[PDB]
Amino acid sequence: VPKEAYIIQIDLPAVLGPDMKEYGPFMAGDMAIIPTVIGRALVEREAARRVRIFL
């Protein structure tokens, strides 16, 4: 389950991922490592921005 870092820009309850795991809840402004499926959907909804962490 590929995961990336995102800044969630709205309040958000715990939501399910494809792995049936729970993710959240999120306070508006939180930065979390979440499955890309959820993050990309929030990005497309203009509700989150990707953040790159160079390791």
């Binding site: 809840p25 402004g29 930065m31 979390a32 490592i33 953040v51 790159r52 962490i53």
Partner: protein, 462 residues
Amino acid sequence: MDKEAFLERVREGAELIKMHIELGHTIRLISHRDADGITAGAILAKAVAREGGTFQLSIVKQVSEELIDQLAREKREIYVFSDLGSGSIELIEEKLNFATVVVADHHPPEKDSFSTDSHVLVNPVPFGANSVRDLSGSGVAYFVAREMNRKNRDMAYVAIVGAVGDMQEIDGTFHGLNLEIIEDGKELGILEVRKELRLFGRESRPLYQMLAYATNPEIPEITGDERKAIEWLRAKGFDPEMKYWQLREEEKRKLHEALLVHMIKHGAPKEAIDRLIGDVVISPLYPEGDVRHEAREFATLLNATGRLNAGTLGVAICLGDEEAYKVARKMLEQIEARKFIIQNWNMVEEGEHAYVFYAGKNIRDTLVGIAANMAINAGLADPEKPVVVLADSDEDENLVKGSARTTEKALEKGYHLGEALKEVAEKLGGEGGGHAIAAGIRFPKNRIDEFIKLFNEALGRQ
């Protein structure tokens, strides 16, 4: 300081975080809003990602019962507080005992450790460290992340950014455990310590704005007067529109010698003069002229993102995200500070020996000293009467902060603003005092009227 006892707490906190990472648990990170907390949050966020773990970072103004209750309802496995929590140890014991808690802070704690199990306080103060000069909140985060994985030493510059934002080097140099972080960054080549002018704006501000906005130290007759700063730099042979980093090394020495002489002539305190040239932390990772190239300029950008409810955007900058840096600059005061005090100079309370202008939240508590100097250098107040600007402390809703500024000619009436502010500080309940011509005070907000009568009576008695 008992450094070895402190390192034992550092390993405890680091081992707990890594244990939950290896258990597959999301590391819940809570960090403070200012530059110290934003860098501390990014240090721990990168440390968790480097171990292959998962985090969810919240940048908050303060730890409160309402915040702890929200965190408790999330039902997490481990909560990690950075740059806060030292004053909330019993609140955390009560509402988060069901989970692992790690507090990484440098503020004086109410208890030297937790009584509950799987709760570790990582704080150097109980081991003999100076809270305001031996290590900052980001420094504690750095120690914990370095114990988790020595590759996290590549965040040494980010930690110093928070240390400079926390004014750990207020006297021009670093002390205590900060020096261990600086040596780490030097070994990795990610930071360099210059001996230069310590004023803000060596990367992005013109030289006249660098001088006019000087606060640590202030420059007499120049702080708060952009016109005199432009005039002064021209007479000394400098382009006032040039940036400090663009000067040759010989041109910088010329500026330093000229500024130091100007401060000796106009009776600047020896403390202010000794702090003009000192440690300035630079990072080769960024181009010169970039805001991130210098620690103080970097810490200034982070504090800006924190005041616009965009703290994690500042965290993303510390993690190397280039788009977040571009977003922050497009998203982002002294000109409005002068416009406010001029267009609202009907709100003052002139007594028999001073002015008192309470601005509320309209002026930051850090710009109060500049605002008082601006009232003198803008045809607003009689230069023979000292000026005191007051503003609500952004860190305490029940407190207010003020600075007392006057001119040299007015000093020749018996005035001394340090002894005047030290007297009222010990008659209202709070800090206060300073030097002869410049001093500050912090007292309860509900006794502003008592301050004006006492400070005028104290000044008139001099």
